[model samples]
Target: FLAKAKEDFLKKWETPSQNTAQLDQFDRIKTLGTGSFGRVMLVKHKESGNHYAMKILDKQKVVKLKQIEHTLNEKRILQAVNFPFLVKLEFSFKDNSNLYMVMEYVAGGEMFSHLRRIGRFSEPHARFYAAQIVLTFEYLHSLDLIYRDLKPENLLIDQQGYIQVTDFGFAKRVKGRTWTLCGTPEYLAPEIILSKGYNKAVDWWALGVLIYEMAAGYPPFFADQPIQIYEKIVSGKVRFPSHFSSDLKDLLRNLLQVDLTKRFGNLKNGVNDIKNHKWFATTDWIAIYQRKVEAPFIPKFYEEEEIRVSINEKCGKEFTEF
Candidate 1:
């Protein structure tokens, strides 16, 4: 038999300090992505012959943002989650200069870039990715985790065009509701902007926004300023583009509902309301989850690459165990 609900969770995740010893593990290969102070490099384990995305966070940025507390919490969130649709955090370690997150290397491209290239995904093209998106949120909701972030960049398309989350951002374990107002303006749910304590419903709303962007090439509530976007989001009216099919339109209307009780995944049946939607009925639910649905499209990855960015400065910062 068992004990407390969270009793075994302690045993599953190791304390961060235990991973402090930074040795030769991954040989950084090609660069995948980069930000202000971070570089995502394609790396291979010293012994294990598998590719991985190693994100190196310059310690200086940690100091600039929040510090050791928030930095460590970010690691905790990544370690806490486990799902195929989410990119895996294989290991995390900190040295004198940087913090390291060795993650699963997605071979294809980012969902944002793909959407930009295609302008818009027609029903058949959008349906396949939409199914995976639904599955991703369904699994996240099952864990009582609210994904406060939902930009297309947060999603990665696999070699065969299956979607996966290079996750572990703005996600939090909110069993009930939270007052934390953190998310892109266009993706913000009405409750969040109004200071009304919000819950998982935000993700469904944000997912609807994402799906809209996927099919329309841009967010429905768009304006030059964020205030305008927030106003439009609270208005909660989606001017369905002419290209959207009836099923997708209905699904988005349900998910993008301002009334939390009326939202598809937020209602009585939970994500089943989303997973069983007519728009997604075109594909087998399990098949999408299993990555068994053949990709109607594919992406290319560059092969010849060298170390693009390297960090050698020393920070001598605090990296506490959680």
Candidate 2:
């Protein structure tokens, strides 16, 4: 089974020259963002007249940085899934100096930007985003993929105000626990920090932290230094403000439990505990996944902007819920 999956993933990139269309066919507009390995640009296809996000990576740099495997995994994973809430990789091509991945663009910008702009989201607003994310994790976990990185910056908001997750740099498919200390400090689970090995439960921990940050305007384990943040996370000492409802606090507590065996989403019932939490009692998981639920906020696009811009530098699965 594993061999077949590996063969299939490799097959997608086997004939890049034949499979990838011409980069000259697309016109670059502006820079969306830049990262250590590459820069992303807003582009438009001349033939289709439709806009797309193009990520250009310096081939030499990628090789020097020893990210070839990571790059291939990103492409393979994106090709593996076709979820509405997830960003899609349309085409991948390369020239002598670089590799290019043409992907769907989401113009509303980063959820990190919006969170910073608004201070914090109301319960309903936070729930709206969290619900969508839950569905995303649900789909990923089902496939045994773990989304190691899940921060606001990687979460893009669409023009329609829906959540579109981007980046796959730290994602990995694990049959069981795999030891790799990577991901945002604040979002890392205790098992990861302790180097005890972890799996999809780490994603659940991140979701809990994301929900807290969305509601409280900051991560629960905030500190001036990364070490301090790790210390706080490992200590499992989280404090919810007065405004946080009892149910919210309870859910966060369960999600942030030090014992992975007892963590809400890691329990026998798994993500169902999350879906059925009191905070989401009224939420219709199907409607949210279908995008039938009205978004809490509709992003205001710039008059000069026609397409949403997202430069995903890296880019999860679980089968428990939603």
Candidate 3:
């Protein structure tokens, strides 16, 4: 793990850092979204008309909060990594106080919202989604990165019913140095719960928590207050619904093991052990990424019409829910 992390870090960030180039070239479209320090807008090239997601972040907020490393890390990591399951960054630039990140615009909206509205996923459906996540872990660890965040909210699907993971803003590239505990409270690993040094293996731990959230209605160690959640996570006691299968229970046990030495994706087993688990026996790995495999459940929205977007999902505007 250490060797892999060093190699990945050297290959990506070893050179003299370059400042972001200017990106005032594109014609801006409708506002897609906004967050604490930035706004997202749909953009199109004036000449080619190619669509992209344009994220604008306040440079002062980023620099003041000591997030330049994260910003640089994201750019470096995304440029070096490629997999169908991960979001693709096309370009990055800055002008004045804002940093702009242009990326592939995934149109299927947020995964958690989609899953929540529809309730839990079926067995085959869960396995299909989990398979892609396992593959994503393989690619990430190959470059010595711990994704650190795997909640459904960070997953983006396209019109084709395929999953694409977005938001690597929290990804840590493990090199000689290690990262402090960081991630959504619900998805953090037991080791991270202890606030000790951790690396790529943490992603597998998150995968376990994510699978449970995907199969069950909610995460395993959830609490209304963050402190209780942290205590339960560090305790490493997983409570499951009676409806959960023995196979799934067994798999979750192996994935979420508290001992960093015995957990999934350590130097001993790597990624194949998780991929070859009995629960995923039927998944055809090659076919999934090629878009040849049929998803276990394609959601109700895709039944009769192909989805297209002129704007990002309108959230509470276009779609009304009781």
Q: For residues 39-101, what per-residue lDDT tens digits would candidate 3 score against the true structure?
A: 777888666689888877666566667766676666667666667888887767554456667
Pairs that collide, model 3: none
Runs of candidate 1 with Cα error greater than 4 angstroms are 1-21, 30-33, 67-70, 302-318
What would the per-residue lDDT of candidate 2 be over residues 1-322, giving only the tens digit for each residue? 4455455544643533223666679987887888766788889999989899888777657767887777767766786665778898887765545567789877786899889999999888899999998988887787778988999998888888899988876799877999999987889899999996888999989999999999999989988899999889887499898999888899899888877888888888888999999999989998988889888778877323333223433220110010
Which runs of model 2 end up more than 4 angstroms from their true locations?
A: 1-18, 29-35, 64-66, 302-322
- Estimate candidate 1's alpha-carbon lDDT, on a 0 to 1 scale: 0.76
What 10-residue stretch in candidate 3 is worst by lDDT?
313-322
Alpha-carbon lDDT, every model: 0.76, 0.80, 0.73
The deviation in Å at residue 104 for candidate 3 is: 1.0
The lDDT leader among the candidates is 2
Cα error, residue 284 of model 2, in Å, equals 1.1
Model 2: lDDT of residue 112: 95
State TM-scores per candidate.
Answer: 0.86, 0.85, 0.82
Q: Least lDDT summed over 10 consecutive residues: which range in candidate 1?
A: 1-10
